[PDB]
């Protein structure tokens, strides 16, 4: 994990999250549960599916072995044909293995950024209102309803109004 989002900050996955890939866990007065944001997991689905097709699409043109026979008096040509056919297979099996090996690393690293950037925007929206615990948890100050959690979920967090109540909560703990 180069970006460090997987493990690092958040080292524990959510088994209860089956709706999508990336989501938010809310623990407020109005119960608790798991919810998903579509704009993040849909792009990952489209990107990965495009990658999967790209491996198949690019590998459409490949060497196709064909049978040739010789009459026991021309063995230099038979050896030449044998070394050419398996030589091309050796070249093509290396490209397929190398392509699979590299694209496996891409998908794991691509997923790192998406959850990392998902964390980055939530920190960038909450900012002073919440505190950073270390495992991805944010503890905000205002005593709003569950709709504010949805407001965080649609990426529409208006700052000013919530600042005054939070700054009254930054001065009572100080």
């Amino acid at each position: 994990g180069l970006f460090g989002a997987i493990a690092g900050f958040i080292e524990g996955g959510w088994q209860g999250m089956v709706d999508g890939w990336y989501g938010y866990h809310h623990s407020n007065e109005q119960g608790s549960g798991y919810a998903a944001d579509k704009e993040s997991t849909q792009k990952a689905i489209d990107g990965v599916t495009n990658k999967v097709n790209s491996i198949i699409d690019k590998m459409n043109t490949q060497f196709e072995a064909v049978g040739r026979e010789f009459n026991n008096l021309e063995r230099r040509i038979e050896n030449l044909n044998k070394k050419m056919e398996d030589g091309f297979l050796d070249v093509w099996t290396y490209n397929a293995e190398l392509l699979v090996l590299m694209e496996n690393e891409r998908t794991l690293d691509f997923h790192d950024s998406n959850v990392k950037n998902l964390y980055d925007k939530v920190r960038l929206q909450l900012r002073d209102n919440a505190k950073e615990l270390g495992n991805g948890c944010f503890e905000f100050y205002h005593k709003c309803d569950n709709e504010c959690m949805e407001s965080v979920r649609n990426g529409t967090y208006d700052y000013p109004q919530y600042s005054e109540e939070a700054r009254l909560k930054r001065e009572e703990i100080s």
Partner: protein, 48 residues
């Protein structure tokens, strides 16, 4: 099969045998015709 059992019953060699098998890879149909009918050899003897 890799090792045919009944191949060239009478001893000998098939000239350009591998050349002919290359042509068979591109042919999908064969038909027999009476190019030179038997019993037309009245001088030479064909049955024996």
């Amino acid at each position: 099969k890799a090792n045919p059992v009944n191949d060239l019953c009478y001893p000998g060699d098939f000239n350009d045998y591998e050349e002919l098998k290359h042509l068979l890879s591109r042919i999908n149909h064969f038909e027999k015709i009476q190019i030179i009918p038997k019993s037309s050899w009245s001088s030479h003897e064909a049955s024996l």
